[PDB]
Amino acid sequence: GPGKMDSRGEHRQDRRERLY
Amino acid sequence: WKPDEQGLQQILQLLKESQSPDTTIQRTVQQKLEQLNQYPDFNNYLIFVLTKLKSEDEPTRSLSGLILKNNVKAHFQNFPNGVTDFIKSECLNNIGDSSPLIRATVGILITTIASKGELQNWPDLLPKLCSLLDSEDYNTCEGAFGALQKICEDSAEILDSDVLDRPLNIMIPKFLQFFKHSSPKIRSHAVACVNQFIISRTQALMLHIDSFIENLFALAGDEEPEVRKNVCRALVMLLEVRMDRLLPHMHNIVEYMLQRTQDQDENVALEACEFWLTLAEQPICKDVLVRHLPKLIPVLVNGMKYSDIDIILLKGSDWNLRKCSAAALDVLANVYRDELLPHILPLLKELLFHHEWVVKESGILVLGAIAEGCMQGMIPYLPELIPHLIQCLSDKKALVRSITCWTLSRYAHWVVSQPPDTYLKPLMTELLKRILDSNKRVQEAACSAFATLEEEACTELVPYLAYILDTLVFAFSKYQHKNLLILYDAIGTLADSVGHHLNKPEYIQMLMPPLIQKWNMLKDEDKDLFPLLECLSSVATALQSGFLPYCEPVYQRCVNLVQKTLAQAMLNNAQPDQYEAPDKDFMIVALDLLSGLAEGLGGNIEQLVARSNILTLMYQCMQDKMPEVRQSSFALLGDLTKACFQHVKPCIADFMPILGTNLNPEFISVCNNATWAIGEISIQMGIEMQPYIPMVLHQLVEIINRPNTPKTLLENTAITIGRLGYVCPQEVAPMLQQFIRPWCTSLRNIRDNEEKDSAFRGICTMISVNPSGVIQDFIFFCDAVASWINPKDDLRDMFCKILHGFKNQVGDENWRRFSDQFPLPLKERLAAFYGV
């Protein structure tokens, strides 16, 4: 929505372990 | 050169002593070499012992060569040319020594000199190496090829350039002559060399591609693993860049690759399996596999079992066959969608319930991999599979539990969309139980999966907040380092999901102490701050006033981290060779937490900012080369504009031309945050904003008229244009009809909140100043006004005045004919509020 756009969700997904 | 008896005796003695089993003798021989290493004459002795002194045994000559190698990789700049050239000569003259250990050391030396030194400093290495390739003695040609292979591997992008003068145009056509070579080793070298230049589309290769492909096919029948492996990786790379040349042979190639994927030599099979991954990205995929898909699916599924070695290792890992197969199945599911399900359901039936845990585990993995591609087709089966997976969460094999966590998380959307009591509730309950599993891999699987579920569920996880926290805090006590970081991410996502509901004294009291504890135990240089800090960022936004007792130390540390980073880059920029550049993530995360503090605390951040140099630092971040730094600093700028503008106002005249230069849609989140910031500064500046409009308006109108620009950027752009119009209708008013269409389209879809209110005020004042700007596209404005559910009364009468005003110019006749085109909800809504 209107407001800031942060990358915290994406950083959190980048450290989720990768199965493959 | 000059070998002396005394010198040789001393160094030979020292080399013997370095091979002593005694630990004290080792440390003192090591410090003696520490001292000797800087003296070039010593290096002359080292190579001399390697290549010339046959009397000495092989491990001594080779150890001399290797010590020399370390000296090169650490002091080669300080070598004078006479010694360097003596080493270079002696190496190339011994490239084919009948001792394998000596040959290997000479080889490592050679490659190290080309690496550490300079390819253009040894102008005649490559030409000579190539001619050595033609030599008679086998070992000589093997050694030269070994060297070239290594050079092409690390110097890849340097022979495909004008640094030298196209050595590839000589090397590549010469390698392709050796694919037919009688010895397996040399064939391998030849192919592995050429392979380095496929994705680069290297001219020398591209204009010989026909001969290349031909020689590759000639090799297909080869049973030597190293050559099969290299042919396989040839075809895989070729598929990505020279597709055209391969189509006419595609059937035989797929047949070959499908055969190799099933090779019992795992290493061959892995390179083969890459074929399916990259093939699934080409648009011609469906057409090419029509004859083979039925076999391809079971072969992939079968390769997705843990290997026997991994089973044993995990009993008490990087790319492998299993990971490649799973990735290939994932992408193929996205290509084929529901068409894959008849291939896949019979395998799943036999795998998901199997009595052998390895087989069951692979089945659950398969079920997860295909989730994205096949979601629609799998819905009918989920009422059975989901309860079954939930049961598997308490399987007695840890590896089954963990994969189940992940697969369930892949179906989280469906779970959330069903009645909470049927799937969500029991899933969450068992997920929480898993989080406290005694197995560390299960713990992390459960935490990731719970986070994914949290993201999807949002508000639906407000009634089960205390129990969630009950479990997450307890994990603090049981988790080790590696898993506490994932826990911080899970807390972060919880705070984002439940927002202000987290603000209760009991929750704050159980959550904050262990977060601060680990904050105090980690140093400013520890990367593990990123998840803790980002977690705190989310918690702060959620806690608001509740965060007051904790902010001061957090604020202070964050500003300092920004400061020391910025200071690091400066110092590195001055003397790059003595001061390593900093990791800017410390700065991004520190800014993001400050953003959260300012959003959370609002006005209550004033005291801290009053005592700080945050804006002086912020000015430097906004000008950084790295997009994410700018994106974070513009976000902080907008938050501080709202919270305590008095400290920001002095900087506007400097900040605005920089905000004006970051309205570039290539960087979505930078452009977005700049735009938002400019709207927020607008509201505080009022008419004082007039001089700044020209630096931003032209760009904002272009951005709002740009096709395929994310919804969120367009909403913020619209709001900001509205806000600029509210404080300065005359400067912006005039362009009304170039933006009104997309402005209305975008803003009609957002919730009734403060930003929307403010922006509509702007569009109303502007209509009063340039009403003809609206006449042509009034349908859009009518729709935008109809989008308001509960407008504050002054905004409503503004609306009614413009609507009533419009009907009185085109007349009851054009009005009725115009409003006939109103969908029913619209016509009724505006008679309900505005009586039009």
3-class SS letters over B748-774: HCCCCCHHHHHHHHHHHHHHHHCCHHH
User: Residue B15, CB half-sphere, CA atoms under 13 Å: how many?
Assistant: 25
- Is A2's CB within 8 Å of B712's CB? yes
**Chain B: residue whose CA lies nearest to A8:** B534
Write out chain B residues lying below 8 Å of A6, CB-based.
Answer: 537, 592, 595, 632, 635
CA distance B741 to B701: 11
Q: Chain B 473-532, CB below 8 Å of chain A: which residues?
A: 485-486, 489, 492-493, 496, 530-531
Which residues does B549 contact at the CB level (< 8 Å), separation at least 6? none
Which residues does B155 contact at the CB level (< 8 Å), separation at least 6? B114, B115, B119
DSSP code of B778? H
CA distance B427 to B736: 53
* Token pair for B397: 């094999």
Is B751 part of the contact surface with chain A (CB cutoff 8 Å)?
A: yes
DSSP code of B805? H
Q: How far is A13 from chain B (nearest CA, A)?
A: 9
| Domain extent at residue B186 | 1-836
Is B756 part of the contact surface with chain A (CB cutoff 8 Å)?
A: yes
Contacts 24+ apart (CB under 8 A), B563-572: B563/B613, B563/B617, B564/B524, B565/B590, B566/B617, B566/B620, B566/B621
Q: How far is A9 from chain B (nearest CA, A)?
A: 8
- Is A7's CB within 8 Å of B485's CB? no
CA distance B189 to B679: 62
Q: How far is B64 from chain A (nearest CA, A)?
A: 44
Amino acid at B717: T
Helix (H, G, I), strand (E, B) or coil at B412: helix
Measured between alpha carbons, how far is residue B110 from residues B60, B144, B213, B810 in Å? 19, 10, 31, 88
Write out chain A residues lying below 8 Å of B369, CB-based.
Answer: 20
DSSP code of B78? G
Phi-psi region of A3 (alpha: psi -120 to 50; beta: other; left: phi over 0): left
Exp. method: X-ray
Q: Are B434 and B401 in contact (CB under 8 A)?
A: yes
Measured between alpha carbons, how far is residue B600 from residues B139, B364, B562 in Å? 71, 42, 20
Q: What is the largest CA-CA distance in chain A?
A: 35
Measured between alpha carbons, how far is residue A9 from residues B493, B502, B659, B798 in Å? 8, 18, 25, 40
Is B96 part of the contact surface with chain A (CB cutoff 8 Å)?
A: no
Measured between alpha carbons, how far is residue A2 from residues B277, B560, B596 in Å? 39, 30, 16
CA distance B491 to B716: 29
Write out chain B residues lying below 8 Å of A15, CB-based.
Answer: 485-486, 489, 531
Is A10 part of the contact surface with chain B (CB cutoff 8 Å)?
A: no
Which member of A4, A8, A12 has the closest CB to residue B676?
A: A4
Resolution, given in Å to one decimal, reads 2.7
CA distance B834 to B836: 6
Which member of A5, A11, A16 has the closest CB to residue B673?
A: A5
Q: Indicate if the alpha-carbon torsion angle B74, B79, B83, B87 is positive or negative.
A: positive
Phi-psi region of B191 (alpha: psi -120 to 50; beta: other; left: phi over 0): alpha
* Token pair for B747: 């803003």
- Is B631's CB within 8 Å of A7's CB? yes
CA distance B188 to B373: 38
Q: Chain B 114-173, CB below 8 Å of chain A: which residues?
A: none
Q: Which of B232, B238, B309 is nearest to B263 (CA)?
A: B232
Count Cβ atoms below 10 Å from residue B20 Cβ, excluding itself: 12
Q: State the helix-helix crossing angle for B824-833 and B778-786, rounded to 10 degrees.
A: 70
CA distance B773 to B775: 6
Overall residue count recorded for chain A in this entry: 20
Amino acid at B750: I
State how many domains chain B has: 1
Which residues does B241 contact at the CB level (< 8 Å), separation at least 6? B198, B199, B201
CA distance B589 to B605: 18
